[PDB]
């Protein structure tokens, strides 16, 4: 899935 | 400050290859995914890649599928496109972009200055 | 076409005020997916001016601002300055594609001088 969450953390 | 900073572009014929660099700087590298952006001489923007921040995923656009690799060097807080069989219409300017997210999609918050790549026969 | 429908230029003059549209369709705006404005100067790199819809980075003026409705999402800017001469994107994602980002075909702003 392309449009999850790419980072380690929410902003 | 979050610093992008691309590097690499030049004017090369078509099937050459080419690697772009993005150091970057202010930021924990590692935490962050990363996109490449690209801009052809006077048209619009067009997403050519993602990273994930961990370096487990890799999404292409489909006109570039194949062709390029996306990678990184958490080490040296830098990102990389490895540009394989370069068409003509690969000619543009190619931007350095962090990863962030919203809700129910994601966006890039910092933008490095650019890069130009012209593919000419 | 840009899946994203913008039009290609809108203008104004100082002090007035102008709204710059995106329509999209079922498998993007449509869906729900979040949509993203930025802003590039004149030979300069983008740069993010709205996101999550409405909301303004904290570095952006209060007379810029976004909204959305149905299919389409439209920027509007209040008091417009010379210096906000510039091109215009929207950005979501469509369900369609197998890329993360989509954008709009861009918007040339011009503050009539």
């Known amino acids: 899935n392309p449009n999850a969450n790419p980072n380690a953390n929410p902003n | 400050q979050v610093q992008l900073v691309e590097s690499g572009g030049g004017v090369v014929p078509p099937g050459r290859s080419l690697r772009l660099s993005c150091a970057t700087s202010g930021f924990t590298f590692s935490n962050y995914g990363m996109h490449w952006v690209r801009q052809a001489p006077g048209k619009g923007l067009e997403w050519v890649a993602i990273?994930?921040?961990?370096?487990?995923?890799?999404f292409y656009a489909a006109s570039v599928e194949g062709r390029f690799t996306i990678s990184r060097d958490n080490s040296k807080n830098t990102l990389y496109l490895q540009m394989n069989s370069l068409r003509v219409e690969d000619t543009a300017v190619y931007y350095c972009?962090?990863?962030?997210?919203?809700?129910?999609?994601?966006?890039?918050?910092?933008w490095g200055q650019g890069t130009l790549v012209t593919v000419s026969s | 076409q840009s899946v994203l429908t913008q039009p290609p230029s809108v203008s104004g003059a100082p002090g007035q005020t102008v709204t710059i549209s995106c329509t999209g369709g079922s498998s993007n705006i449509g869906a729900g997916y979040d949509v993203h404005w930025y802003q590039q100067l004149p030979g300069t790199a983008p740069k993010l001016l709205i996101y999550?819809?409405?909301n303004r980075p904290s570095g952006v003026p209060d007379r810029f601002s976004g909204s959305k409705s149905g299919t389409s999402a439209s920027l509007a800017i209040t008091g417009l300055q010379a210096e906000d001469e510039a091109d215009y994107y929207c950005?979501?994602?469509?369900?369609?594609?197998?890329?993360?980002?989509?954008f709009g075909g861009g918007t040339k702003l011009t503050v009539l001088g």
């Open positions: 999550g819809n409405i």
């Open positions: 950005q979501s994602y469509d369900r369609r594609l197998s890329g993360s980002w989509v």
């Open positions: 972009a962090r990863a962030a997210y919203y809700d129910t999609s994601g966006y890039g918050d910092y």
């Open positions: 990273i994930w921040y961990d370096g487990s995923r890799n």
